[PDB]
Amino acid sequence: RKKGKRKGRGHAAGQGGSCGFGMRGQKSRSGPGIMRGFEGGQMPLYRRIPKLRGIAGGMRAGLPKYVPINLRDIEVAGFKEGEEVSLESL
């Protein structure tokens, strides 16, 4: 149990009177910050790069079928006449 930062209660406790936000400006003010990923009016990365071939209008991503096991992974779970190694036993 750490005991957190009740913030702005004397300059000895440290993070006091402005509370570790420096000096005015957008990040100082109360309320929401900005958009997250916002590059300041410069074109954001997330909107100046093309979008990943298949995911650009249709084409559902290759969601996996088959529930792959391996022969390496079976050997650890041992049974002599391994009676139907299937969806049931595993």
């Binding site: 997250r36 990923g37 954001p44 990365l45 997330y46 909107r47 790069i49 093309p50 979008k51 990943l52």
Partner: protein, 70 residues
Amino acid sequence: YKMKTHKASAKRFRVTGKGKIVRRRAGKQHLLAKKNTKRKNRLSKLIQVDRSDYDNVIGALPYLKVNRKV
């Protein structure tokens, strides 16, 4: 309430098996005739996002399973 994913960005950043963010290169949609055979091959392929901009990308979509190498 429970974080919405930034599905504008998500569609430009995929994550690979080992856990690195990957993007497509910019440039090669049109005005292709005037570029070389050479540079279109470098613009075809995927690379990592630069270590600088990981912060914004991870911050945008928080259900990635992305490993900053630790």
